[PDB]
């Protein structure tokens, strides 16, 4: 098959003729189908049991439920018994006669048309009674409710005018209907003006244990009692098109009608093809139809009365900036008091709950306005909305609280505001303490050793701390990242001004230097600037480490209510920053090794000349450097201090191979220049093992460099049957000073000539190409790295 | 049946296989003219008579 030669594959991956492995792969194959054959097992029992259970019921219901329409055949057609028979008695003459009286209600609607427009027109004041309250009219539920059965006696007038529509005669709805403006108007709005006043009654702030009971229970009992009225002429016309839309749209008309149907086709005559399923027989049987407004079209105006009192509690400036939601919150207080009040006045209608969260539609568009642009506080914009947010919703089920929706878009205004700000905050702290450092006499506060702290940075510190309690204070991942990593931006501004004018402090001790001991024809004018750089840039890389305190220890400190994505997207821009926490120790403190030198640039060039030969250069060099650090070596940062005085032997080492290129004939005749690669290597050895003290350096971070040195001896004072072995160590971990550097050698020589160059230091250059496709496919670029010497015609 | 075709097993069994079929048919004619009495035993050659 083609599985199955797939699966000859399968079991091809056992061998070719592999009858043991061909067995365990059949016992793999056994075990794919045990337990593909479990789940199908389990699964093909709940399908055969749901299978049971759909023909079981399919079943049930065919005939047991064929036997419940059919036990309505049972039973309806034993309605079908007694429909000429019962009741035992003249039924006849009971329902032709004795009802036909009940075909002649004549009197009982001329003195109760004519009393209910006299005794309706009175109760246009008693029925309708207000001012102020008396319990709500005194008592709506007699008094606003007798405004509603009289509206629904005047229902006759109101809603079975609806019905007799034509039924008889031309004044039963005419000398009837002046008996109907004060008849109906003056009871269904005198039930509307106790209704409108029922729940504007119940919209005073207690409101009240009786005159909301009474009032409400009107507006519950009108008010379910007008939905199941109107729900019953409504299926008077779902009944109808239940009934006369099986009639007239049968379809067997089938025009079907011009034109009293399609239009309204089913309503469909009144009286009573168009009424009866509203009115009689009929045992409710007008449909009420009161009060149509008590609460069933008026409890909108109760939750809309804390949703009107409570949006219109706004006042919206906002009275100080955003105190719409105090008082719209405070009717949102009162919106739950009045609805659970009202709900123990008024089970059926008349705001049951539904006042809260319409105050929830008030506090909630309310918030979302005082603060839509940056109108209010913009400072405290957020923080006013979201603390009614989530207050609002602790002050409720949590549920009568301000749904915003505009809180994120002014965090956006935060961002603005706090990245903007700290623009020229970050700007000022930098310019404030660049100019201080410029005045080198007094350093920054107050250590001996060095370790200083500063004083801008400090408010960055502590105040910037202060800056992102509206980030962690609201938990953002749009702020407390997006301040903090666009802040990290601003700290790369930062660090670039620590370049820019903390090499201007470097330019300021070079010139200082030259007015020191350095040759002072070079006088600038903001370099009047004597020895006391390192407690400036080692103060920088303290609060580097303190922008790691805060920053990087703050910044792990707080930041743990979200995931560690969001708290990740943090992380990625405060705390690699560490890194950054020496990297203006890469631009700093490469110029303090630089402003060590830069009062003895004599030494410097006199090596390799006949005075550094015999003379006191090394004491100079090795001994003035070896006290510059014994002063810096209390006053230095240790992550600037590792790098740091690696790169003082390194620099130190290049400031000590600086002329190579000055071709003074080397005198390893008569060891001049031999012993001053000897005898003071013992004086530039205690620049490495005296400079280093308390820690175990003086070798390990030298090592590498008394690599150059015990090579570069074997360079510039061996003879030329020892210079190739020189360019073959000293290849074998220096190839970054390439071999043109034995050129300079043999520029600085004269007995070791240049076609020996050719053979040594061109084989030797072969050497250096060929391993370096061999050997470093040796280590890096390092103090010997672009020194690279000046080569002649090989 | 299964063809198979080819090379896992089956082919390199079918050789064993056809081989041993002319196998059977050799020592078949073998005992078949042993006692045809071609050669004259009880057996072949191994005279009971």
Redesign the interface.
């Known amino acids: 098959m083609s599985s199955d030669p797939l699966q ?1 594959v399968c ?2 991956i056992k ?4 009858l043991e492995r061909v067995r365990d792969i059949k016992e793999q194959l056994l075990k794919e189908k045990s337990v593909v054959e479990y789940q199908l097992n389990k699964e093909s029992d709940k399908y055969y049991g749901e299978v049971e259970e759909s023909l079981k019921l399919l079943n049930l219901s065919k005939n047991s439920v064929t036997s419940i329409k059919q036990q309505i055949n049972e039973v309806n057609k034993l309605g079908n018994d007694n429909r000429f028979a019962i009741n035992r008695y003249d039924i006849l003459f009971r329902a032709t006669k004795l009802y036909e009286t009940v075909n002649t209600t004549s009197s009982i609607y001329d003195r109760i048309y004519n009393f209910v427009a006299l005794m309706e027109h009175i109760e246009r004041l008693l029925v309708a009674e207000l001012a102020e309250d008396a319990l709500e009219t005194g008592c709506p539920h007699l008094l606003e409710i007798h405004f509603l059965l009289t509206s629904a006696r005047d229902f006759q007038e109101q809603v079975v005018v609806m019905a007799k529509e034509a039924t008889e005669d031309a004044q039963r709805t005419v000398m009837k209907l002046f008996s109907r403006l004060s008849g109906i108007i003056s009871k269904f709005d005198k039930l509307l003006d106790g209704l409108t006043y029922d729940i504007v009654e119940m919209a005073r702030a207690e409101q009240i244990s009786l005159a909301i009971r009474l009032f409400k229970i009107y507006d519950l009992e009108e008010r379910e009692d007008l939905r199941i009225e109107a729900i019953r002429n409504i299926i008077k016309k779902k009944e109808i098109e239940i009934e006369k839309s099986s009639i007239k749209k049968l379809p067997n008309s089938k025009n079907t009608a011009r034109l009293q149907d399609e239009t309204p086709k089913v309503i469909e005559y009144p009286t009573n093809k168009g009424l009866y399923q509203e009115i009689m027989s009929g045992t409710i049987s007008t449909r009420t139809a009161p009060r149509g407004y008590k609460h069933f079209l008026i409890n909108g105006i109760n939750n809309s009365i804390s949703e009107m009192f409570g949006e219109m509690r706004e006042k919206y400036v906002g009275d100080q900036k955003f105190d719409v939601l105090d008082n719209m919150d405070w009717i949102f207080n009162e919106l739950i008091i009045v609805k659970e009040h009202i709900a123990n006045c008024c089970p059926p209608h008349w705001n049951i709950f539904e006042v809260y969260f319409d105050q929830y539609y008030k506090e909630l568009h309310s918030l979302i306005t005082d603060l839509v642009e940056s109108e209010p506080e913009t400072i405290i914009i957020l923080d006013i909305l979201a603390f009614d947010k989530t207050f609002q919703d602790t002050l409720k089920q949590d549920k009568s609280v301000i749904g915003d929706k505009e809180k994120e878009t002014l965090f956006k205004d935060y961002l603005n505001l706090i990245v903007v700000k700290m623009t020229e905050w970050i700007g000022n702290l930098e310019k404030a303490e660049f100019d201080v450092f410029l005045e080198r006499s007094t350093p920054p506060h107050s250590d001996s050793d060095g370790l200083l702290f500063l004083d801008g940075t400090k408010t960055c510190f502590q105040m910037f701390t202060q800056q992102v309690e509206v980030a962690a204070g609201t938990n953002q991942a749009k702020i407390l990242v997006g301040v903090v990593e666009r802040f990290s931006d601003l700290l790369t501004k930062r660090q670039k001004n620590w370049i820019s004018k903390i090499s201007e402090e470097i330019k300021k001790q070079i010139n200082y230097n030259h007015k020191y001991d350095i040759d002072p024809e070079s006088i600038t004018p903001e370099d009047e600037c004597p020895g006391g750089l390192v407690e400036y840039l080692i103060a920088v890389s303290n609060d580097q480490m303190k922008a790691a305190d805060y920053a990087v220890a703050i910044s792990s400190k707080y930041g743990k209510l979200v995931s560690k994505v969001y708290e990740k997207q943090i992380t990625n821009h405060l705390e690699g920053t560490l890194d950054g926490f020496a990297e203006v120790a890469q631009c700093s403190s490469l110029g303090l090794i630089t402003l060590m030198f830069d009062d003895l640039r004599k030494p410097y060039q006199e090596i390799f000349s006949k005075t550094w030969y015999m003379g006191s250069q090394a004491q100079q060099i090795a001994d003035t450097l070896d006290e510059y650090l014994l002063d810096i070596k209390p006053q230095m940062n240790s992550v600037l201090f590792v790098n740091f005085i690696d790169n003082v032997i390194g620099e130190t080492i290049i400031k000590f191979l600086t002329a190579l290129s000055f071709e003074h004939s080397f005198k390893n005749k008569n060891n001049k220049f031999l012993e001053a690669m000897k005898r003071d290597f013992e004086i530039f050895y205690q620049l490495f093992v005296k400079v280093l003290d308390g820690n175990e350096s003086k070798d390990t971070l030298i090592t590498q460099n008394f690599t150059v040195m015990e090579f570069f001896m074997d360079l510039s004072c061996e003879p030329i049957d020892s210079i190739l072995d020189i360019w073959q160590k000293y290849l074998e971990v220096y190839w970054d000073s390439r071999i043109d550097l034995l050129v300079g050698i043999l520029k600085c020589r004269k007995d070791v000539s240049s076609s020996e160059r050719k053979k040594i230091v061109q084989q030797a250059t072969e050497m250096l190409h060929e391993y370096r496709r061999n050997m470093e496919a040796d280590r890096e670029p390092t103090l010997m790295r672009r020194f690279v010497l000046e080569f002649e015609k090989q | 049946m299964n063809n198979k075709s080819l090379k896992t097993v089956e082919i390199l069994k079918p050789i064993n296989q056809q081989l041993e079929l002319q196998e059977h048919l050799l020592f078949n004619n073998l005992i078949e003219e042993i006692h045809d009495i071609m050669y004259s035993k009880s057996n072949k050659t191994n005279f009971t008579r």
């Open positions: 000859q079991d091809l061998g070719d003729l592999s």
